[PDB]
Design a protein around this ligand. Structure first.
Ligand SMILES: O=C(N[C@@H]1O[C@H](CO)[C@@H](O)[C@H](O)[C@H]1O)C(F)(F)F
Ligand SMILES: O=C(N[C@@H]1O[C@H](CO)[C@@H](O)[C@H](O)[C@H]1O)C(F)(F)F
Ligand SMILES: *Cc1c(COP(=O)(O)O)cnc(C)c1O
Ligand SMILES: *Cc1c(COP(=O)(O)O)cnc(C)c1O
Lengths: 809, 809
């Protein structure tokens, strides 16, 4: 029972125990004789949920009364993770429930492990949406998250024979106690059809109809009694439509919300994905307009509504809003456009070419004929403005067009978003600058005022208090609990950098987390890691730009050095790498095989002993991140400079006591700036260096010829040293590294290895390592999503955040 | 507030109101400001459900302790209807909830109309299963109903342009508060594959797996605190099985429990239907064996288990039980067969050839290879016994074989059921006799001891107390409430046949029900019936053997007679016909069109006035039956003698104050016997007369030539009198009646019309009509399903029914 977990008052504990038994009986229809751990988990979940409803109802009633400006965050992904503990934390019910369940003879931690992750996201983009919802509630904003209720989220990853196997994430199998179906608010969504031009306006007719049924999930703010809503739409066929066959084919319409596309930073132009994108936008906008008409001059629309587009996925919101205002409300084009631009804002999350959405015209033409017409009109009017500002610059006109010519005509959704939004932002200072100097340079020159920066952040509730109570406690002991909702206060810890007691406590918490994780590794998965070794961790989606391959080269280097001088001392390390590969990404799947293949050799070499271990963490997800991050010593953030827009895992590691080894990419730059470069392990090419190399031409052979250790590794891979039975198993990997590596792994190899040596040197000095850690934790305040959201609120949405408690429950 | 509805004590009402508000708040997450009638319905449903759980848990605990013989009723259909009122009735909570909701400013009757019917059945067979579950709980039997949870039940019928239109019955859209998902008890079901013969036994391998997830619904007995279980299986794909496509194809496995085949007395040999049949049998038997091993000598299996097969739909239970005992438990064939025969019993529900299941061998061969082998072995051993009992009778061998030769080999499932069951029963005395003299004559000669009769019945709770409180009340006033669970006591009403007060009350209740229904007809559907007319009703599924066409001929006759002598007095009538037609049954759909077509002419003829009205009751279902039956004066039960196995609607009408006009078919024979033929309107050919006609040869032309009035009707139909714009619209109907009428409508026409004249004559004498009604109600006791179930229990299952209250809640 620790401080930050709240009070366990003898009135609340008694009440919780009583309600727990009531739900077990009436809700689950069970008794203590046949109840299983899962039944107990649900009884607790319903009990905690009850405390949420009263606050949920009055929060919504409050917004109705005060009628503030509403913020609508549109996203195709919300990576929520588990909800039980987070709810207890935000309601200050953790110790009380811990005590209550204890008295009932149950271990609450065991029950929490039963909850399924709500994996409605792929990684960074989806988790950001989740942290944002938490911060918006904590800052008292009338915010609504709108998305899709996929019945199958990100697939569960299994490793067989060292290869990734995918299996359906049937997360709703045992039910979801957090959501509340609202079938009464079902809305129709139209597809296909054709456009008819009548006396007064165009009409979209002969369409196929799919119903959108909403499910609401509560989003509690941190101890302020505010509970916002996340509304997720589910596809339903109308009862309108051989009898048997007709009923069975209903599943054709309902497939829209069936599964999440498992791609991270990769565009797949499939019809089903386009349907999902329009589905969420169409249902959401009707809901927004309906709520507004209760709040008909749409001139005040922008004063009461703000729509934030999470990348281009919900970009159809722009032409859909125009369609409704022009075709249905009958506003003149110019007025409708003014309203649209003023309510929409766009956030770009990547500059990688293969990740940008460019939809084939023939697809939109067939699926959304009216929207295509509106997009052409928008393009026509936009290009007229470009032509007026840059007379005779024809090359500029074709570069800025929303319509892309070539093999097949495509619509550049990013161009559409910029043209129809009053603000466009990047997610890290360096990323936002790259947008203005390269990808969106032409647009920045036309409308400089639209471009902004909003550096990403993470919520300190889930990423500190929830996953690392031990650290939150020792910090609270010295500076109070105020920092949990005002992370900048962590700076006060700077005056404890020479405090012998604090140094000891910080190191003790880390050691306990490592023992806790090392245990979990054996209990689940039966591994064999040594808690005394340096925990070197790289967890994130598998992708070539992330460079898990560079990490692999270092691991093999360490192994070869040990085999060369067996009785020479080296700082023991446990290298952990985890992450999922998109099912259709061949190279990513081969990288996973390589990692397990290296472990097969290294982990069973008698000469290596327990000085080096290579472990691939299976099924990396939010719940696993909450376990491994607090236990890490070294955070690997090694993407090629200019490719990771921001990164967020990097922030989680910094807040939890791990030092960082990384490139000057994304938010790493601002992190190093806040902590001081001397307290960061920076290495490799800077963005400018990468450009110079491309000017000259990247030739990997050069590095291979001049670096003996590197040559040895490539020869081991090519000869079958890591794949005896299949000598050429890794031929594709070697071929790519040698002839077509877009991310120049070899170019940063030497500096990476040398930087890693400096990390080992510091680890040998426990006291100085811990002092540097304190320097990092103390300056991580800027990376709280509360800061990020406060900036979006003031600089983009035009609303003031608030910390005032809502009038109790 | 009437007597039979229970007490409304000031302690219970206060408690109900408090729990009602709690559910509205915590469960529905609403407040009195945004709540709609549907929200109030759910708040009440959850409140009533709560009172059911405590009794549900202890009932199951009781069975576990005493370990009585268990009864398993297997059926592919359970036509439950609505559950709220039935639950209140059985728990004696109706007046209390009426008062509680009244104090909350709500009308409970309005809320009850919001509940969706659980239409998991087609008609008679499915409703019988439902009445049986009610009676088994009321008689204290450890019974379990096992079936399939179709996500789409019997389709909702819409009438457009006088034609039937079908629309999906999405009954689970707003959720089902009565069921409790039990995902923890999920079981695997195998399909396809092949058979491998090993050293010790055969093995069924390389199968496709589909999971069966159970949902439990409580079944409360009448005021005895017993709550049994109805377990319905739902199909789930294993998470085992392009990534996207693979996930979308999961719906291929889950289609098994998607929709109920909408056929009544018609066999459709489709693969999907076969999968549904094995699915329910496979999951159920594993559940049964699992529960048994807790209760390994299977010799005691028949002493602890009874499996009742509702027709041949679950017939695969026989070979599946053999498969498990022989292949899995490793019992010798002879021992396994002894156990199987002793635990299984089969109930036949029809003699109509097109309704009997005869599955093509090639289907079983591909879908269930091991079962086909077992069926061949059973057939081989069975025929060996036949050959030994009737040496040299080769014709007998081919007639009795389970394998039917011909175009395509088929398995006669009825033969399989008789061979593998220790008891076979018909559902009405005349039907059971027909089985022994015709269809199953050979089997009866071989094993006479197996054949029995169990005349159908209906539950007096739903079919009297629930739907006709007014009548239940006036009856209770004179003889007490004991008859509700001992219907034979209604005989005491015979001593009131000359009681002027009772006569007046019986007639008053009927008039009130008629006004109540006449109102509903306008409020919903905007009709124009006259409450003073005789309510002539025929409601049941549309089928040629039911002869809705004969009724049509009478209606047209009445119309023509009025047009012939306009100013002659005739007893006013409101003829109501309702029922659904199977989607693929052309003739049935044409009959519906004919009925609406007749109404279009008759209802708008100025000369007819309000002396005759023809109304087609749309979407006939259980909830509608509860409204129209209590309001009927005349019950039409006119199937051709020997075609309606029993009928159950006939019993509902008799118990509710309507007189019956019908043929000596099914249970009509026993009803007339109980009430006295003088108190019934019997007409037409008897079974023997139908046979004589077939011997001679049925020639409809003869009747057409000798009956002028009949000739006129056929000429009106043929000339387009009832279809001006489409003169030959009813050509198919006329052609069938004249050249290929298997049910000889013309043969009973004259006697039918004359009998109808006798009905009108009696109606003109209110006092004598009511006295005959009292004679019917008073002798309807034999038709209580409590009597039927008591007989199944004692003569087939070997268990004693009980009326003892269970040790409170
Ligand atoms: O997932 C995408 N972008 C991702 O967004 C997150 C959140 O801003 C960033 O931290 C990360 O660097 C970036 O790759 C996308 F969609 F752009 F490909
Ligand atoms: O539905 C069928 N049979 C029906 O069963 C009910 C219930 O016993 C009888 O009352 C009815 O007469 C009969 O047609 C079936 F399945 F046999 F076609
Ligand atoms: C935070 C998080 C991410 C993002 O990690 P990066 O290293 O920024 O790519 C991805 N997946 C999960 C489950 C996360 O919690
Ligand atoms: C009782 C009932 C039936 C059976 O009626 P019969 O006239 O015996 O065919 C059919 N449908 C419903 C909804 C019923 O309640």
């Amino acid at each position: 029972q620790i401080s930050v977990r709240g009070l366990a008052g003898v009135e609340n504990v008694t009440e919780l125990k009583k309600n727990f038994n009531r739900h077990l009986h009436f809700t689950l229809v069970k008794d203590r004789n046949v109840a299983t751990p899962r039944d107990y988990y649900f009884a607790l979940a319903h009990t905690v949920r009850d405390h949420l409803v009263g606050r949920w109802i009055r929060t919504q009633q409050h917004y109705y009364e005060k009628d503030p400006k509403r913020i609508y965050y549109l996203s195709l992904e919300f990576y929520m993770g588990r909800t039980l503990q987070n709810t207890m934390v935000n309601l200050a019910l953790e110790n009380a429930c811990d005590e209550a369940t204890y008295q009932l003879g149950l271990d609450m931690e065991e029950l929490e492990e039963i909850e399924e992750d709500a994996g409605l996201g792929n990684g960074g983009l989806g988790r950001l949406a989740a942290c944002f919802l938490d911060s918006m509630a904590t800052l008292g904003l009338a915010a609504y998250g709108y998305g899709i209720r996929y019945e199958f989220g990100i697939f569960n990853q299994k490793i067989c024979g060292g290869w990734q196997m995918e299996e359906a994430d049937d997360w709703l199998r045992y039910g979801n106690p957090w959501e509340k179906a609202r079938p009464e608010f079902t809305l129709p969504v139209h597809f296909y059809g054709r456009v008819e031009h009548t006396s007064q306006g165009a009409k979209w007719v002969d369409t196929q109809v799919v119903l959108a049924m909403p499910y609401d999930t509560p989003v509690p703010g941190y101890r302020n009694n505010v509970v916002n809503t996340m509304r997720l739409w589910s596809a339903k066929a109308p009862n309108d439509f051989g009898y048997i066959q007709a009923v069975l084919d209903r599943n054709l319409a309902e497939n829209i919300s069936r599964v999440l596309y498992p791609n991270d930073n990769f565009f797949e132009g499939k019809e089903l994905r386009l349907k999902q994108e329009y589905f969420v936008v169409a249902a959401t906008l009707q809901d927004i307009i309906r709520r507004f008409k209760s709040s008909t001059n749409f001139d005040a629309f922008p004063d009461k509504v703000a729509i934030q587009l999470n990348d281009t996925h919900p970009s159809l919101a722009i032409p859909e809003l125009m369609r409704v205002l022009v075709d249905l409300e009958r506003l003149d084009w110019d007025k409708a456009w003014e309203v649209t631009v003023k309510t929409c804002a766009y956030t770009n999350h990547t500059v990688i070419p293969e990740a940008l959405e460019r939809w084939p015209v023939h697809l939109l033409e067939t699926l959304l004929p009216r929207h295509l017409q509106i997009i052409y009109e928008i393009n026509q009017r936009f290009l007229n403005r470009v032509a007026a500002a840059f007379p005779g610059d024809v090359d500029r006109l074709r570069r800025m067009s929303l319509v892309e010519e070539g093999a097949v005509k495509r619509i550049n959704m990013a161009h559409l978003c910029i043209a129809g939004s009053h603000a466009v932002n990047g997610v890290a200072r360096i990323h936002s600058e790259i947008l203005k100097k390269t990808i969106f340079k032409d647009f920045y020159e036309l409308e400089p005022h639209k471009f902004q920066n909003k550096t990403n952040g993470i919520t300190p509730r889930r990423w500190l208090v929830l996953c690392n109570p031990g650290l939150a406690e020792i910090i609270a002991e010295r500076i109070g609990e105020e920092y949990i909702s005002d992370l900048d206060q962590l700076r006060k810890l700077l005056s404890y950098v020479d405090d012998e007691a604090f140094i000891r406590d910080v190191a003790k918490v880390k050691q306990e987390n490592k023992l806790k994780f090392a245990a979990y590794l054996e209990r689940e998965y039966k591994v064999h890691i040594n808690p005394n070794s340096l925990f070197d961790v790289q967890v994130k989606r598998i992708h070539e730009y992330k460079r898990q391959l560079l990490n692999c080269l270092h691991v093999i280097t360490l192994y070869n050095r040990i085999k060369k001088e067996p009785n020479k001392f080296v700082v023991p390390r446990t290298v952990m790498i985890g992450g999922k590969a998109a099912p259709g990404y061949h190279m990513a799947k081969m990288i996973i095989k390589l990692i397990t293949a290296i472990g097969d050799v290294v982990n069973h070499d008698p000469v290596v002993g327990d000085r080096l271990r290579v472990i691939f963490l299976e099924n990396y997800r939010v719940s696993l991140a909450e376990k491994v991050i607090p236990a890490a010593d070294l955070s690997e953030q090694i993407s090629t400079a200019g490719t990771e827009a921001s990164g967020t895992g990097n922030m989680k590691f910094m807040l939890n006591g791990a030092l960082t080894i990384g490139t000057m990419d994304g938010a790493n730059v601002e992190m190093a700036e806040e902590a001081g470069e001397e307290n960061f392990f920076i290495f490799g090419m800077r963005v400018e260096d990468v450009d110079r190399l491309d000017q000259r031409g990247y030739n990997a052979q050069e590095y291979y010829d001049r670096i003996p250790e590197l040559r040895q590794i490539i020869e081991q891979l090519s000869s079958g040293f890591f794949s005896p039975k299949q000598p050429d198993l890794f031929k594709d990997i070697v071929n790519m590294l040698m002839h077509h590596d877009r991310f120049k792994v070899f170019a940063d190899y030497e500096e990476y290895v040398k930087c890693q040596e400096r990390v080992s040197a510091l680890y040998k000095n426990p006291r100085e390592w811990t002092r540097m850690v304190i320097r990092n934790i103390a300056t991580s305040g800027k990376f709280s999503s509360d800061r990020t959201i406060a900036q979006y609120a003031r600089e983009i949405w035009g609303v003031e955040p608030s910390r005032q408690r809502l009038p109790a429950p």
